[PDB]
Write a protein that binds this ligand. Structure first.
Ligand SMILES: CNC(=O)NC(=N)NCCC[C@H](NC(=O)Cn1nncc1CO/N=C/c1ccnc2ccccc12)C(=O)N(Cc1ccccc1)Cc1ccccc1
Ligand SMILES: O=[P-]([O-])[O-]
Length: 497
């Protein structure tokens, strides 16, 4: 009965705001007018991106920004709300460029959350910016607070949330109350910086939007799918950094939660979240990419999957060889490594040499260019069927995606997601989810329902014995135990009544 959220980033850079126009796509490729009223109906949230934190340790626009043209752009977005009384125009603070460990504004993120007074000043600047520009809530996209900073970051979300609540009461906005989201890490390495405090991070949020993409990159040594839903045994596996987080769990508890190595996948990151106590399924939103990542230098035999490769990893892209054949946007943006779905469709349709292939374990598509040795990992309306069924089945809150201008012109990716959740005539009850590798970790937050005979005092239990006691089902870790379950370390809690 609750509508799945559908959260779409709208990114526009300072130069384009300052030269804003809706009638010249070589100045602004994706102007607000491209968000038609039928698109506005399919979205629950649009994430205007990106604001920053300045050296005053306040949320601010980039200072080169033309303020009147910024307001004009935001007003066109907030005007969309007339087609959809559920729709929110959020704004987003951060992104990779601003907030990465080596980003130009990084120190500001660190310092803004560092003390109580600085959090109060930061928090106030967020709401004040929200109210002044007419936005409907705040999304924080710091990539990423480190374990030392995370208590500051949490405090900062708490205080912002208090100020959003005051503000909803002052504006009478209980029918569409002001909201707080974050863009969360979607792979265990980054996730491990804050994983041990996930319940605290998510509690003040309406949603944690997982970046369950960018899970392969030039930075890995072997090509892979950047957003595989489930795992492929023929693909690479990785060290599970969460087994080293500061959780205070036992070896058995750690081992059962965090198999290692493991398959880097959407499913994995979602289960990683569900394992933790006090992270509800309904606040978890699955990110999907509206773009592919492209590799060169590959030798297939397997469609260019799981191949060594020669893709530069530097930033900026370090030369002018735009090798991604038929990628015109790539030339425009001076980087062949990232191609929008809108462009990939045109590459596949033209005579550029690609085949579209499908991995039935990962439930994701891929292009392969056999004559030049290219491999592209992307998502389409077909991969979205499986991800949408997963969202419904796992009782997740919705889907988030980056970014709106990467949809094709007709908006088919977005229409597909709206349809899989909301169309009466769409049936996925027979959609086969396949036999790819599921992440099987179990933690305190996702214990299965189980039954077992009642624990009996005096009985000598062997290894593996299952009993039920004080609301749970417990298993002995070795034999022969006679202790009451929960009273010492012999018993592992494995399930709930
Ligand atoms: C909602 N937030 C996000 O979705 N964040 C996000 N995807 N962050 C990672 C972004 C890295 C990206 N950069 C690259 O991917 C460049 N690149 N391509 N191949 C290699 C590189 C170099 O950067 N690698 C970043 C990276 C990203 C993720 N994990 C890593 C792990 C180890 C090392 C590096 C990474 C980037 O900075 N830009 C392009 C881009 C943004 C979003 C999605 C895909 C691409 C710049 C940009 C442009 C317009 C608007 C905002 C941001
Ligand atoms: O570089 P990292 O383990 O967050």
């Amino acid at each position: 009965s609750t509508r799945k959220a559908v959260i779409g980033y709208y990114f526009i850079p300072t130069n384009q705001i300052n030269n804003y126009t809706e009638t010249d796509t070589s100045v602004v490729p994706f102007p607000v007018s491209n968000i038609t009223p039928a698109k506005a109906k399919q979205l629950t949230h649009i994430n205007f991106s990106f604001l920053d934190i300045n050296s005053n340790l306040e949320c601010a626009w980039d200072p080169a920004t033309n303020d009147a043209k910024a307001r004009d752009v935001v007003n066109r977005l907030t005007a969309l709300k007339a087609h959809n009384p559920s729709l929110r125009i959020m704004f987003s603070i951060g992104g990779w460029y601003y907030s990465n460990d080596l980003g130009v504004s990084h120190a500001n993120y660190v310092n803004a959350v560092k003390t109580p007074a600085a959090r109060t000043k930061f928090a106030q600047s967020c709401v004040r910016i929200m109210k002044d520009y007419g936005f409907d809530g705040v999304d924080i996209d710091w990539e990423y607070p480190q374990a030392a900073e995370v208590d500051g970051f949490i405090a900062a979300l708490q205080e912002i949330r208090t100020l959003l609540n005051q503000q909803t009461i002052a504006d009478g906005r209980q029918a569409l109350p002001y909201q707080l989201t974050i863009a969360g890490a979607g792979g265990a390495f980054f996730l491990s910086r804050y994983y041990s405090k996930l319940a605290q991070i998510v509690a003040p949020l309406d949603y944690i939007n997982l970046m369950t993409y960018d899970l392969a990159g030039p930075w890995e040594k072997i090509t892979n799918h950047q957003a595989a839903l489930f795992g492929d045994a023929a693909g690479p596996t990785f060290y599970n950094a969460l087994r080293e987080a500061n959780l205070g769990w036992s070896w058995e508890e750690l081992t059962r939660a965090f198999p290692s190595p493991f398959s880097l996948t959407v499913d994995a990151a979602v289960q990683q979240h569900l394992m933790m106590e006090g992270v509800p399924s309904a606040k978890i939103v699955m990110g999907v990419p509206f773009y592919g990542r492209a590799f060169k230098g590959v030798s297939g035999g397997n469609g260019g999957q799981y191949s060594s490769h020669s893709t530069p990893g530097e930033d900026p892209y370090p030369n002018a060889d735009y090798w991604l054949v038929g990628c015109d946007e790539c030339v425009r943006d001076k980087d062949p490594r990232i191609a929008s779905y809108r462009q990939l469709e045109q590459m596949l349709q033209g005579n550029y040499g690609y085949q579209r292939l499908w991995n039935d374990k990962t439930k994701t598509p891929y292009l392969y260019h056999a004559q030049n040795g290219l491999f592209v990992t992307y998502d389409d309306a077909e991969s979205f069927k499986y991800k949408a069924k997963y969202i419904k089945q796992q009782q997740l809150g919705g889907v988030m995606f980056w970014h709106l201008g990467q949809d094709n012109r007709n908006g088919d990716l977005l229409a597909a997601l709206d349809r899989y959740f909301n169309a009466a005539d769409y049936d996925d009850s027979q959609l086969d989810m396949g036999t790819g590798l599921r992440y099987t970790g179990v933690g305190p937050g996702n214990l299965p329902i189980m039954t077992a005979p009642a624990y009996v005092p005096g009985t000598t239990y062997a290894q593996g014995a299952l009993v039920s006691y004080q609301g749970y089902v417990w298993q002995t870790k070795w034999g022969y135990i006679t202790s009451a379950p929960g009273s010492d370390s012999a018993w592992l809690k494995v399930g709930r009544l």
